[PDB]
Amino acid sequence: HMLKLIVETKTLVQSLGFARSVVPEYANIKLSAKDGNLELSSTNMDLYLSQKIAVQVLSEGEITVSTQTLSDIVRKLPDSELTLTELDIMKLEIKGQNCQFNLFTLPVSSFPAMDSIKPEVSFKISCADFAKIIESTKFSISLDETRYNLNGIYLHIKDKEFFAASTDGHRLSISWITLEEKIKNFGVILPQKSAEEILKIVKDLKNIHEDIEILLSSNKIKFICNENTILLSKLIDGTFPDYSAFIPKSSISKLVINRKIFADSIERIAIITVEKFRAIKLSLSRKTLEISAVGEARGNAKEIITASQDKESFYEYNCDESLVIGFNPQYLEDVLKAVKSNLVELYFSDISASAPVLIKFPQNPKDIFVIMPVKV
């Protein structure tokens, strides 16, 4: 029972790309030819990835081989198809039309099998909706390794909604999907690296228009993406903070502005700042918005945006009293880049320059962002 199969090279290159992003045994990939499919298994300390791709199975069997060596070779081969043949002397032959590679294999019995999940809840959502909630929350995870519980994305069902939420203490990001069926409340914290891997998977063109099944338990999360890709992940063992208290419940005024002109202007003005004072200042009035910054021993900068009801230059602030408030420009940019929207809204809770600011994008009612100001 020796593996032998013919595979479309471009298909194998894509699967190996996912395997590379997962990672002595962790350096290997397990290849299993069975029932018309090649199953590729990859694992590290926190993730187990199993991918099935259709191939011509000429003989069923299993081998394991270096992930890096296999990937490096296959992505340099110009043949539209490759033959993979397990040979007697613990070697995998990779054959193109004019070239042949023989790779040392390692015992299949040394490669770990996947663990299992006893889900508390399971549900199906579209890959496109799941990609959105991860894209809207992955950037505001804490990188402070002491804040163990903030080092991932909180995925939780509450009422009929599936939320992703993240915070680092300076900003909060929330994005959700409505679930049709009744599902009990449950939550887990997905590690950053697992969020990055599952995002790459669902965004693949083969999967982005399909569905992903999600299974949650107290100690694991399992993704089944478009039937043929399974990702099992450990969780962060912590309790996510109750962030509902962080969300402003009322506003005294709001800024509405063309998202691109706002993002581009923040980026230009922020160039003058120094690491010790990463801050830009917004001076808001009905007639104009001034964006300014200073940098010690560097200089200063300002840009003026004038009131406009035209979509491409939109600026309005319907309040008689002006407001001056500051923000970390990187944190504002993170939000503005997360949602492809023509306009963005900033809601101010009170006249102070210290209260949290709520950010929403019109036409995107299932994304909420909160950013703390900085003194300027």
């Binding site: 804040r147 203490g169 300076h170 900003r171 903070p241 962030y243 962080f246 949290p356 703390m372």
Partner: peptide, 10 residues
């Protein structure tokens, strides 16, 4: 650089 009202943490 004030934080969100995280208790504890701020």
């Amino acid at each position: 650089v004030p934080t969100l009202p995280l208790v504890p943490x701020g």
